[PDB]
Amino acid sequence: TALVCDNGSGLVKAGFAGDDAPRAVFPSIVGRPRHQGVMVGMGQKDSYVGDEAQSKRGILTLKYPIEHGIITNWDDMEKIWHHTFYNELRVAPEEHPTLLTEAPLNPKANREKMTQIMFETFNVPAMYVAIQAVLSLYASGRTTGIVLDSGDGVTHNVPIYEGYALPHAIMRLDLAGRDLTDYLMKILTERGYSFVTTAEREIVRDIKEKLCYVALDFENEMATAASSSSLEKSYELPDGQVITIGNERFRCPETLFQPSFIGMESAGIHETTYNSIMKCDIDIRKDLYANNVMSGGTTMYPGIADRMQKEITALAPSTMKIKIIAPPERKYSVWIGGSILASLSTFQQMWITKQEYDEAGPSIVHRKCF
Amino acid sequence: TALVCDNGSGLVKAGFAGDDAPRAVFPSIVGRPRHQGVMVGMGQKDSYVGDEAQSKRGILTLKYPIEHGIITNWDDMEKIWHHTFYNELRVAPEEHPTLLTEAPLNPKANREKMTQIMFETFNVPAMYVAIQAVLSLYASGRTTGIVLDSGDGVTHNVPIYEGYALPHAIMRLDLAGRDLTDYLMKILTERGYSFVTTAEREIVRDIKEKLCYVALDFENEMATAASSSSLEKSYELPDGQVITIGNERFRCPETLFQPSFIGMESAGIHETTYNSIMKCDIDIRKDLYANNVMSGGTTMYPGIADRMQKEITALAPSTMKIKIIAPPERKYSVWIGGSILASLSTFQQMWITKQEYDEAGPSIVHRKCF
Amino acid sequence: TFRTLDVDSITEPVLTEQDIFPIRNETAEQVQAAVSQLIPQARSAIQTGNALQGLKTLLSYVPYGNDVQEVRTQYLNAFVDVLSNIRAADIPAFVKECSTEEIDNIVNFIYRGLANPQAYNSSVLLNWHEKVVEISGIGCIVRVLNSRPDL
Amino acid sequence: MSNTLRPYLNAVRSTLTASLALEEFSSEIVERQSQPEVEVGRSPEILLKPLVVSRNEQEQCLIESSVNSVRFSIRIKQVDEIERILVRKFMQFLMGRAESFFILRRKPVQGYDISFLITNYHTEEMLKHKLVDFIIEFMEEVDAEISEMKLFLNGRARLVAETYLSCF
Amino acid sequence: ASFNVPIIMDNGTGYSKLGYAGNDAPSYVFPTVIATRSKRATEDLDFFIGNDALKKASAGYSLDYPIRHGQIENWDHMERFWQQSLFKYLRCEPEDHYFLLTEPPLNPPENRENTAEIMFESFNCAGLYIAVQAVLALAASWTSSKVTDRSLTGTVVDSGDGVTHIIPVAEGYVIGSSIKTMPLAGRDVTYFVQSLLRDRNEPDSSLKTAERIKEECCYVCPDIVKEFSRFDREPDRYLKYASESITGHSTTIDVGFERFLAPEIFFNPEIASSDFLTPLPELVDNVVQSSPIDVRKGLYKNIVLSGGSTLFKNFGNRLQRDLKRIVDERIHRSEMLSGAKSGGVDVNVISHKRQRNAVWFGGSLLAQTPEFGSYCHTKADYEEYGASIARRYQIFGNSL
Amino acid sequence: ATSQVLHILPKPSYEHAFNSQRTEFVTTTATNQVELYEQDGNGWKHARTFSDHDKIVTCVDWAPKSNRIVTCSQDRNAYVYEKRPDGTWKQTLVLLRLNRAATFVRWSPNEDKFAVGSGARVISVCYFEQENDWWVSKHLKRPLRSTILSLDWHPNNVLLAAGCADRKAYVLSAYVRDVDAKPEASVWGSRLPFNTVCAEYPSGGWVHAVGFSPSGNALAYAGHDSSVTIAYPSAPEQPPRALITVKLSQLPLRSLLWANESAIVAAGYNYSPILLQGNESGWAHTRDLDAGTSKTEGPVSFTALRSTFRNMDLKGSSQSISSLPTVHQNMIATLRPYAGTPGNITAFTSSGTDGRVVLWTL
Ligand SMILES: Nc1ncnc2c1ncn2[C@@H]1O[C@H](COP(=O)(O)OP(=O)(O)O)[C@@H](O)[C@H]1O
Ligand SMILES: Nc1ncnc2c1ncn2[C@@H]1O[C@H](COP(=O)(O)OP(=O)(O)O)[C@@H](O)[C@H]1O
Ligand SMILES: Nc1ncnc2c1ncn2[C@@H]1O[C@H](COP(=O)(O)OP(=O)(O)O)[C@@H](O)[C@H]1O
Ligand code: BEF
Numbered sequence A, B: 001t002a003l004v005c006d007n008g009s010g011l012v013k014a015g016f017a018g019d020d021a022p023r024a025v026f027p028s029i030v031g032r033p034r035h036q037g038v039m040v041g042m043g044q045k046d047s048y049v050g051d052e053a054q055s056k057r058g059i060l061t062l063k064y065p066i067e068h069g070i071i072t073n074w075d076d077m078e079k080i081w082h083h084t085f086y087n088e089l090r091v092a093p094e095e096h097p098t099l100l101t102e103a104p105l106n107p108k109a110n111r112e113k114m115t116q117i118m119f120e121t122f123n124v125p126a127m128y129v130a131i132q133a134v135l136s137l138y139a140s141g142r143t144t145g146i147v148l149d150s151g152d153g154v155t156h157n158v159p160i161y162e163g164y165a166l167p168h169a170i171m172r173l174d175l176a177g178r179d180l181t182d183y184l185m186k187i188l189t190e191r192g193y194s195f196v197t198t199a200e201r202e203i204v205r206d207i208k209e210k211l212c213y214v215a216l217d218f219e220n221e222m223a224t225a226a227s228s229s230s231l232e233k234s235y236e237l238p239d240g241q242v243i244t245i246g247n248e249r250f251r252c253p254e255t256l257f258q259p260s261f262i263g264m265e266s267a268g269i270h271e272t273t274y275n276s277i278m279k280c281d282i283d284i285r286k287d288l289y290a291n292n293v294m295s296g297g298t299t300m301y302p303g304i305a306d307r308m309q310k311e312i313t314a315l316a317p318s319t320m321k322i323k324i325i326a327p328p329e330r331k332y333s334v335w336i337g338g339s340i341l342a343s344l345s346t347f348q349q350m351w352i353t354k355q356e357y358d359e360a361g362p363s364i365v366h367r368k369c370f
Numbered sequence C: 001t002f003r004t005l006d007v008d009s010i011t012e013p014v015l016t017e018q019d020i021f022p023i024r025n026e027t028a029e030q031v032q033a034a035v036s037q038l039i040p041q042a043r044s045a046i047q048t049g050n051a052l053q054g055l056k057t058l059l060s061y062v063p064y065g066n067d068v069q070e071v072r073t074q075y076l077n078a079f080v081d082v083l084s085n086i087r088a089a090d091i092p093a094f095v096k097e098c099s100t101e102e103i104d105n106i107v108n109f110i111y112r113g114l115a116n117p118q119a120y121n122s123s124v125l126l127n128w129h130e131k132v133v134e135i136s137g138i139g140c141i142v143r144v145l146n147s148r149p150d151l
Numbered sequence D: 001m002s003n004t005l006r007p008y009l010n011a012v013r014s015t016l017t018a019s020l021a022l023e024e025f026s027s028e029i030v031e032r033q034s035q036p037e038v039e040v041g042r043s044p045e046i047l048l049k050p051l052v053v054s055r056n057e058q059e060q061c062l063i064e065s066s067v068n069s070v071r072f073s074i075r076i077k078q079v080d081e082i083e084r085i086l087v088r089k090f091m092q093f094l095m096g097r098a099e100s101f102f103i104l105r106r107k108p109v110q111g112y113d114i115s116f117l118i119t120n121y122h123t124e125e126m127l128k129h130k131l132v133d134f135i136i137e138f139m140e141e142v143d144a145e146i147s148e149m150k151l152f153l154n155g156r157a158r159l160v161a162e163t164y165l166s167c168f
Numbered sequence E: 001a002s003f004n005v006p007i008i009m010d011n012g013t014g015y016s017k018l019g020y021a022g023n024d025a026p027s028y029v030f031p032t033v034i035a036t037r038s039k040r041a042t043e044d045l046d047f048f049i050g051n052d053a054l055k056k057a058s059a060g061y062s063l064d065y066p067i068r069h070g071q072i073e074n075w076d077h078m079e080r081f082w083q084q085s086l087f088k089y090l091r092c093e094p095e096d097h098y099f100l101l102t103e104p105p106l107n108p109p110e111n112r113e114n115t116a117e118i119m120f121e122s123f124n125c126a127g128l129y130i131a132v133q134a135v136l137a138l139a140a141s142w143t144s145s146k147v148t149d150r151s152l153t154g155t156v157v158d159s160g161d162g163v164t165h166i167i168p169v170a171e172g173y174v175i176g177s178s179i180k181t182m183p184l185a186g187r188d189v190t191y192f193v194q195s196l197l198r199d200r201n202e203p204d205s206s207l208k209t210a211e212r213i214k215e216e217c218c219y220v221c222p223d224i225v226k227e228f229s230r231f232d233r234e235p236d237r238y239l240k241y242a243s244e245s246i247t248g249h250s251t252t253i254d255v256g257f258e259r260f261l262a263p264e265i266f267f268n269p270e271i272a273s274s275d276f277l278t279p280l281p282e283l284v285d286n287v288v289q290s291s292p293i294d295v296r297k298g299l300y301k302n303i304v305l306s307g308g309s310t311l312f313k314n315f316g317n318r319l320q321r322d323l324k325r326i327v328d329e330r331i332h333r334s335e336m337l338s339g340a341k342s343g344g345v346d347v348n349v350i351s352h353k354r355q356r357n358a359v360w361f362g363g364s365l366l367a368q369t370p371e372f373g374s375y376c377h378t379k380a381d382y383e384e385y386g387a388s389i390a391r392r393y394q395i396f397g398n399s400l
Numbered sequence F: 001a002t003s004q005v006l007h008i009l010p011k012p013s014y015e016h017a018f019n020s021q022r023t024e025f026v027t028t029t030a031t032n033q034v035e036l037y038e039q040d041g042n043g044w045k046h047a048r049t050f051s052d053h054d055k056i057v058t059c060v061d062w063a064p065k066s067n068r069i070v071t072c073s074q075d076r077n078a079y080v081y082e083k084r085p086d087g088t089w090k091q092t093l094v095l096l097r098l099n100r101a102a103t104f105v106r107w108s109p110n111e112d113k114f115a116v117g118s119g120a121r122v123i124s125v126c127y128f129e130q131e132n133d134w135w136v137s138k139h140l141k142r143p144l145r146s147t148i149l150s151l152d153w154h155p156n157n158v159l160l161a162a163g164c165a166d167r168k169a170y171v172l173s174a175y176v177r178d179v180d181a182k183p184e185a186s187v188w189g190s191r192l193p194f195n196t197v198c199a200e201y202p203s204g205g206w207v208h209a210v211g212f213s214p215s216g217n218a219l220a221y222a223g224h225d226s227s228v229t230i231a232y233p234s235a236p237e238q239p240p241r242a243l244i245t246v247k248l249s250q251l252p253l254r255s256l257l258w259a260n261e262s263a264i265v266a267a268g269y270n271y272s273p274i275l276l277q278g279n280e281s282g283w284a285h286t287r288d289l290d291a292g293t294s295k296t297e298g299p300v301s302f303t304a305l306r307s308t309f310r311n312m313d314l315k316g317s318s319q320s321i322s323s324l325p326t327v328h329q330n331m332i333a334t335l336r337p338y339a340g341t342p343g344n345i346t347a348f349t350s351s352g353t354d355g356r357v358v359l360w361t362l
């Protein structure tokens, strides 16, 4: 067995290769206390990690060590990996290879320090660093398609044909569920309700995860919510009081299809997918159009597969069929795909091994993992 | 049963003597992946050949190993013979004597090396290297006639009377269906369709096959198409985009009659046929005009028989019959003629046999073949 | 040293193939006569074109024994010659009418013809092998595996 | 490949499937030991007659069989000295891996190119219809594998010829 | 037989030493490393080896070491390493020369078979001898090749970059029932020096810097709990080492208790492995006591050191004193039961001028002998019996 | 006829026996263990292992009325296992005195003695003595020339058929005094002391299986030449009334069972039981009991995702390796009565080298 540790920017998703689904899913958060620690003894800790922080958050400054899929704070990222292996999986990491992941078009130094900490702190016996939108394509049961992965921090497209990636046609967009959370705070502020702190940012994430949905036709949905009760509904806070919301429920997800709302100049996710298909060689485009693959938690909004199929069918030539593949387990497909990969018998030849790291130094990942 | 291959400069035609048509017809292509394989488990393969390369082409750089009827990349030609023997016909080359086919006025080195490979790499029991135009008279059932063969790589006339060829009156022209694809790619740019890659070349080869024709008078057809949409057609690319095509529908095949379009200084196929007949002895011309035989895929354009009869009737003396026999099987008529020749009772003494080759070396071929 | 001196060969006498298969009752000259009368009937059946009645009569007796290679080889020469002179479309009409005893004599000798390609054309024996096994089933090879070694 | 080997490989497939009727068998000459009786040959009554299947003087199979073991040995096409070297070496890689192709011998029987030993334990713990499909799919493809290697040898003979000759 | 100087190749896990018999040093000593890539196919021509393949890590080649724990274990890489050794560096013709190759005592027969088929079929060499490497290293001890300078009885302790093994040899015969082997040597102590620099988080801990800190700074102390205590009392023992990075800039490394705790891997191999628990002085006593009784005075009297990882400052004296302690304690137990005295046994551990490459100098000195062409596998024997001609162990007792 | 797959065993199952209540069965895995399986509603559960043998177990049997298991192995031992009142099994070593492996064992119909075939050229007929609490072995050895591949007892306690690798099927008297009552004067003989020989019947190949008719007046046996032979004896020293051999078109039979006085099921390397029918005038193969004789989208599971990639990686391509059409996927090693009155088998069972244990109803 080998660990598969998809340290995403919003959730760590971890477990064992060939296991059905990730067994350690928790916030990619380190919390530190912000108040007068008056009661002596009491089992107090200098910092808290994951669900241990999320449940204590009313006294903590929660901060994610990872932003837009790039590690910003290594002293806390080691704290998350240590929590993953010793507290959440309860293994010794020196006994198991780890398949890690990262998004494409990351800094070189991210990939180096992430191999160095696995070999020099966690003492791991072998490791590998897969591209997240390649893994999501194993989890679809395919060898050609265009994975749209979108998580908490990054959205990216990787077009693949016959198992060859077309790396010139990879699109990264630094917009995903954390920007939709920050935008939901900016529009909730307009109805009556103020959310400000790093802990209140989790309450509005827990709104976004169950009140929001994607409108199939935003400009007509906007007129319908401005003229009826049916689109409005309510959520009950930790403080027992009720929050009622309406056109905020679909204006939030719409930022993915209209990044101009949060001040970005870019294509939306629909036109970013088409700009990746139209960068590919002309003979493969039909087999990409019939195999768009949704992945990552930001693709979980009710109606996003219907909307994505509508917007791509308007951009694509009407002569040919579009399919969006969106399984119900697309919430974890990058982990699911790493759990396939780390169990394929040729894969056991591809690991960076401890001995090979010791001899080659941390630059070995650049001449073995892609 | 003997084999017969017409190793065409763009399609391989291969089969067994006494069959009515080729057993296997496939592009004379070898392709290598241009991109990086990211999937494991996939059957990654270092080269594809024939129809598999034509099918996977969106990720391949495609090479033709024969240029103007001359083999120019021997390694990718040995791959194609190994594909004809072990994959397409799926018979071992040692079991059957084998008729190969070649254009007139080729390098001596081309026919020697093609003999040395067949006896010392494919170990064949016997072989013969017939001239492609001499086989077109067998297919047409003639013993007197002037052939006009035109393939992917080359166009040539061989005038023949009562089975005696006139090798001083052979005209050979390195202009045929490849240079018409290269020119159609160029003039397609003037309507705005940029085709550039070795795989987009195979889309523009298909446009040329599906839509082009030879117009009975070019200045009249130009003045027609300049006024009207009635001569236009539309073709759906494998992308689902539709191109629409104008006077370049017939300005492409006119290159055969006006080589100055592609900058080269030579007589078009009409004048080069008339010059071949005017080089011949005066008593035989009167029969060469009556038995003018076409062959090879570049002679398949709609209206090319009527264009060719109109032009030869304008050149040749009006007092006698011009009669062009372009049969409906002419696409394969070199192979069909080879399958007749290799089947004759009187030909079975004419093979170069292995025991007769290795006492003389590959220079035996020039003293048994034409 | 002693480790290599075999003793089993001189203190525990092993079985012989004539203990496992009953010895032939007919004497060497008695079978050499019985074959030499049949081969001319088979050679004649080729010369009159009725080669299939050649096989039916040739296959009515079989020589076997370690004493008779110089006539087992003549019987095999006549059998391979007769198999090379039956038309391939007549084979399914011959094989479906053979007894399971005659079939097990055909396929037993085609595996003797396939053992000596420098004297027999394998291509026609492999053709008979496909047709005899496709028609009469895989057990007809199992009866060859199990058969007498001096056939 | 197939169409020229089709008569031969249907004879080999049919012989080899009739030959692979194996069983557990404790040896009669040694106590508390099983041994592959085709390979030892010390008790004759549990050997079956050795059968040859053959297309040509070059291309042959010998099939030897016993109550718990079958040995199968083949000669493949070697029509010039380049195929003699390429075959003789290719089989030494293929037998050098015998610990992971469980049915291979590490040495051929004398005068054969490669040899297989399908023991009872293999027909109990592996799919025996996929064992004969591997033997047959090896005999179809090995002529295409070796002929391709003599193309790559010509390809390098050109690589070094052009690279030497083009720097005058 | 050909008369040409036999070619000698000690392919170590760390360094290959190459040359011709009868020269006074190896023609080359360079790392056993190959640099490889990670319309004709040429990725098997583009490789480099030795000192010219360290220069290639920045040019995007992957370096790999085809010998690990004293055994060849990548045969594609080792064949390319030999062709390049023979045709670039030694610049020889194999068909003219006999070759002496070396391997550890406990190598698998499969590796001698693969070595023989590569030498006889790929290179076509005239003949081959595959020498057990520590059996040669005794012959580097002599003051000269001449018969009166020989001392054909002595224990030989060999320790390179990848294996240590102790071979007893007496009256010119290798006592094969008594060989001891431990796959812990110069590289495993480098990974330990590297592991310590890395736990202190020093500016550089690349393999080349731990490899240099071993041979610059480390030594074998008497006892590590007193040496840790000395590093508190005696603060000039914390050396400062200046290292230059892979990318061409300065750094400074403090070197600490790895100055003694790293060579201690030989005298306490529990530090390195769970599997090889027996320390080198007791591993040597297990060799000499397993050996037949009359040679034991001779085997202790002459314990030859060999191979680069025996060169640590004070290594010979630590081995001599800890082995003398094991030996005189055992003799004094025997004096106790008897009440009589003994003459004891002298234990000498012999460090000497050719200790850095002793196996090569041993191979060179043996291969000069007129008999050498008769001990080789000649290619005539290869053409008769095939590569199985090399499969039999010369050293151990064989059944059959 | 219908097949029901009772259990899939993790290892090859050369032999098995169901207890007389058909509630539990013993079976020989291809190791020195013997598994005991019990009912689990409609399923079966592993109850215990016996493990008293040194080497691979070769055969096993379970006495109907007296409820004792007997076991053979390549270690040359046999054990008899007998139920203690507390619910566990008392092992007991039987001194077979064999020079080579024990191959095949059967309890006699009165269960007072059991016979063990061997590679040692002999058969050890074992019986128990209340005077000594020993099991003691008598060696049948006069005509046997090679390994004994199977045994069957006559329905009277005396006569023992044995199939031997010297291509013959023997009928021997195994009368042991002060255990058996006198044998009745019958078709096989009347002068009937231990090791007297009633037949040495021929075969084309090794005789894998033997069995007497339910009336005892005929013997059937089966060769590695893929034939079944039925021998109809006349009297001592006299040729048989008939020696009918039916040659099958299939791979060899390994096991054999009279369904009634006029029909036989047989099975083996053909992966399927077959039915033969006849009498002393003639016999023919008449049916295959397996319908496999005739050779007869939605969401996708994680284990189908992982296995379609492991198939592309380990094997040629994604596509699954097919089943055989028969119920068994490998040679069917043994074939045993299950239900109906003695001499009218209504159902039988088989166990395979694939580890299937299967119930067949006619
Ligand atoms: N049901 C849902 N509806 C909308 N957003 C969701 C839903 N489930 C998860 N998310 C969002 O997905 C993000 C986490 O997705 P994930 O794929 O695990 O990201 P990452 O890999 O970067 O950690 C968070 O912003 C979370 O709120
Ligand atoms: N129907 C057609 N109409 C026009 N061009 C054709 C047609 N069919 C084939 N061609 C062209 O003819 C060439 C192939 O003809 P072929 O006789 O096989 O040439 P070659 O023998 O040299 O390979 C290609 O350039 C192909 O595009
Ligand atoms: N002075 C020294 N002190 C300690 N180790 C040394 C010294 N000089 C060289 N070495 C070590 O010797 C080893 C190389 O020795 P060598 O005999 O060539 O080993 P090998 O034969 O296995 O390659 C390396 O670990 C090297 O760092
Ligand atoms: F880091 Be998550 F994939 F956005």
Ligand code: BEF
Binding pocket: B007, B008, B009, B010, B068, B069, B132, B150, B151, B152, B153, B154, B296
């Ligand atoms: F062979 Be093509 F006619 F050039």
Ligand code: BEF
Binding pocket: E011, E012, E013, E014, E069, E070, E159, E160, E161, E162, E163, E164, E185, E307
């Ligand atoms: F490989 Be070295 F000899 F340790």
Ligand SMILES: [Mg+2]
Binding pocket: A008, A009, A132, A150, A151, A152, A296, A334
């Ligand atoms: Mg993610």
Ligand SMILES: [Mg+2]
Binding pocket: B006, B007, B008, B009, B132, B151, B152, B296, B334
């Ligand atoms: Mg052509």
Ligand SMILES: [Mg+2]
Binding pocket: E011, E012, E013, E133, E159, E160, E161, E307, E359
């Ligand atoms: Mg060394």
